[PDB]
Design a protein around this ligand. Structure first.
Ligand code: MN
Ligand code: MN
Ligand code: MN
Ligand code: MN
Lengths: 105, 82, 94, 99, 97, 106, 99, 85
DNA sequence: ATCAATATCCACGTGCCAGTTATACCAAAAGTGTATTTGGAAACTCCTAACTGAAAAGGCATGTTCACGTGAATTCACGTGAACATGCCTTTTCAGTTAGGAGTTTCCAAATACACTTTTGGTATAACTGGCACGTGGATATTGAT
DNA sequence: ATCAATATCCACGTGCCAGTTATACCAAAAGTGTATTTGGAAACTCCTAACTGAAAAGGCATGTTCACGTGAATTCACGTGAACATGCCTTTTCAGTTAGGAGTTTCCAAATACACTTTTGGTATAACTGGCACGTGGATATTGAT
């Protein structure tokens, strides 16, 4: 009696991802390798964002990740910024950027 | 005092948005142009959200209706469910 | 008599796996909840069209892989395909 | 006697102040009344979750801020520092929203 | 072996053309464009209907879903006339059975 | 006597085929009978709207046969059809004649 | 004695000429080589349907003509009539391709 | 058995780039434009072909089909009519 | 350059709320175990169309010369946003009454699911012709030199 | 204004192929009719959270002074357009070779389908606390006038 998530070495629920594949009308049949594979990719991507966001939280000397930290983690990583270029982060803010020609001296 | 609702977006508020966008100098005619753009945007989104609300046979526009409406415009939004 | 699913449990577990001394606010937790659902939708959708284009009735792990290549930029694609194939091999042998 | 900063310094001060922060810049109540007026012209007697109004304020402010970024680029492209209505109209025509 | 039947909308595009312009022909390239248009508009509408029923936990795509999809996807005046043509064909289909 | 559902609903587009592709496409588990009829009527109308504007463009060019150029002129000159097909490219379509005024001489 | 049109007359003549037509402006054989080269250096031993190359050439020329329209707007916005690489970069930045 | 392929972006000649700019309604063209245009065209062509070939690999095929190109362009947001559905 | 006015961090301490924690149900999934059905991987062969090549022709590409008009550089005047102080009204922050979201349950009109019959759409070969591409000269419009 | 030089609009006349037509083949859908399953409209009832109201706080509007950035004007060097001579590389049309796409058949590993068992995730009340917002003084940085 073991869940498929531990049998695959993941923290994300493989059984649920299998259920959402069936009830989402994506196709009539779902092999068991698909929810495991998809659950692995969702956990990996989640970890990559949480890592960079945590570093942003420490660099502002905070211990808890707020949306601002997630925004700084995404808009500063090139590939994450490409994946979510058409996404708006609530309570995210903008990256500090002043065009050089506006500066004095 | 009587004035339109589109004027509630006050000139210091539009100025604050431009400052977050890195703008240094703002011509006067911008403030009316910005109010027109802000209205066109809100009109397109709410029309789609309301269309979702009617189809659910509801009378309360929900946060998911607006999220699905923004998602339809290509303006995806994270952090309000779904 | 109501139940709202989310991914907050597993996002928190993964958070403790990478930053054991870091918490996460509720707003930031809702953002992660949207990100998991969006990335699921894009992958599952692209996989569905792949199965259809080739007249197939099953979404297999091979489809999810091809969808990952199309959706994820370079280095993110390489490591995502790896972690995916790693978990599938481990699931099959066990 | 009165100390006055030269034109442009307070602005650059506001830029660093408002790019560092995250809060909403439009006031809630003027925005919420603007939403209900617009919603009334589509379907009468509508009620809104508090979260639904907030989701619209986050979405529209994020849209206008990103539009001022592209507007500012057009102004700098014309050897200017002042954004003008023709700058916004160029940025919206090239995005594909207008024309 | 006989090659499979490659379906298209060539017949029905040609019918609708003869109703509208009875003395105008169409080239195979333009007919190819029209085939791409029908299949494109089909997948936008049917997809938007699929998401619509899913947001409301419904397992059926009814004509009510197709209509709300049309309201969301078509611009103003084109949506008005399209909803009209759709409703007429639906009620006429109902009364004839 | 058998009569097709397309004549039963007074349409020139195939209602039965549109029903099959709705099931075959995995858009939902069940499909009522109104949805294929309604959608078939919409596709037929939009087809007619484009062929009307295209044939006019073909006639203005002294041609008796529609080519993709006429379809391009039709779509790009009608605001609502142009908005519906903004992110679309017509093979062998061309562009609308448009010279920015500041480039003209004198 | 010899007849010379002034600089710009034959340009405007060509603009009208090439906006009236629809045939492909890039050469067929150079374009097919370019497509095969790019495809080769991604995966080896590939064959192409003739239509597949034509589809790519259709989308490519359509993409560049559109990008030139937005480029032409950026130069005119800066009080010019000559398009320059910084115009194209501004067009692709606001579009979201270059960001 | 085939000749090696290299530096084919130069087949996109300067007159061909000028014609595309004329149809785009451009009157005067700087000299630095032609290389920048080649750079843009190459990035575009790479992105659509990369996706096109990926569909071809998943189908276990050795022939890139026009449908693979159409799917490629569609998922880039460049929908194309006239080469199959 | 020396200063003075103003803004800006920095280190420390403060209460408060949202975050973390834990406990108890428990229905809702998820897992298990069985019988059952089926898609599609594998053989094979058919045959479409992609690749290859040769050879001739002229439509364009290349590169040079040269002049002209455009872009960049520089000046300059004035008018419009920025800065700032002030006066105050709209926004912000809290309470208790019901609209309507959302749950539960019944049951009928409507959906799928089978088998069977019927005919519409697609392929094909043969057949057909007029629409359209191409080539031509000629009348007209435009352009640039004067 | 006059003028010639050049390109362009337009009707005419021409063969050829693509498009239209008609025949039959026919398997593949689509329609028909039966029995079967089930979703979701309809009652009903429960209960979040959306609206209404009244009272407190700091951000908005107005008006004044001026600094400087914007547009308009003028110059000049040179880079880009226009033209032509030169000839190469693409276009065009045909032919035959075979890779590999695509059809058909067989058949098994892997899917679904039920009933059944196990526990995990979500909710809720109650509890808990330390992380962060916020206030402060006081040291430094910045900015602008002399
Ligand atoms: Mn190579
Ligand atoms: Mn000049
Ligand atoms: Mn028939
Ligand atoms: Mn072979």
């Amino acid at each position: 009696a073991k869940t498929r998530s531990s049998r695959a070495g993941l923290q994300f629920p493989v059984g649920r991802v299998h259920r959402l594949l069936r009830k989402g009308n994506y196709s009539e049949r779902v092999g068991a390798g698909a929810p495991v594979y998809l659950a692995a990719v969702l956990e990996y991507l989640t970890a990559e964002i949480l890592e960079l966001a945590g570093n942003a939280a420490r660099d502002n000397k905070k211990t808890r990740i707020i949306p601002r930290h997630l925004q700084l983690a995404i808009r500063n990583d090139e590939e994450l910024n490409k994946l979510l270029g058409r996404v708006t982060i609530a309570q995210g803010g903008v990256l500090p950027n002043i065009q050089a020609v506006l500066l004095p001296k | 005092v009587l004035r339109d609702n589109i004027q509630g977006i006050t000139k210091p508020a539009i100025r604050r948005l431009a400052r977050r966008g890195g703008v240094k100098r703002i011509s006067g005619l911008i403030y009316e142009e910005t109010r027109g753009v802000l209205k066109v945007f809100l009109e397109n989104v709410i029309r789609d959200a309301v269309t979702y609300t009617e189809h659910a046979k509801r009378k309360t526009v929900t946060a998911m209706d607006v999220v699905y409406a923004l998602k339809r415009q290509g303006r995806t939004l994270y952090g309000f469910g779904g | 008599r109501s139940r709202k699913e989310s991914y907050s449990i597993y996002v928190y577990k993964v958070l403790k796996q990478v930053h054991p001394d870091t918490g996460i606010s509720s707003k930031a937790m809702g953002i992660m909840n949207s990100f998991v659902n969006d990335i699921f939708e894009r992958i599952a959708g692209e996989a569905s069209r792949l199965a259809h284009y080739n007249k197939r009735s099953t979404i297999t792990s091979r489809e999810i892989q091809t969808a990952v290549r199309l959706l994820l930029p370079g280095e993110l694609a390489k490591h995502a395909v790896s972690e995916g194939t790693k978990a599938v091999t481990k699931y099959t042998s066990a | 006697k009165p100390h006055r900063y030269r034109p442009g310094t307070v602005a650059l001060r506001e830029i660093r102040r408002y790019q560092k922060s995250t809060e909403l810049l439009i006031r809630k109540l003027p925005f919420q009344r603007l939403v209900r007026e617009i919603a009334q012209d589509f379907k009468t007697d509508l009620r809104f979750q508090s979260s639904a109004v907030m989701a619209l304020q986050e979405a529209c402010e994020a849209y206008l801020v990103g539009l001022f970024e592209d507007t500012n680029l057009c102004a700098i492209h014309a050897k200017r520092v002042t954004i003008m209505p023709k700058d916004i109209q160029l940025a919206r025509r090239i995005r594909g929203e207008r024309a």
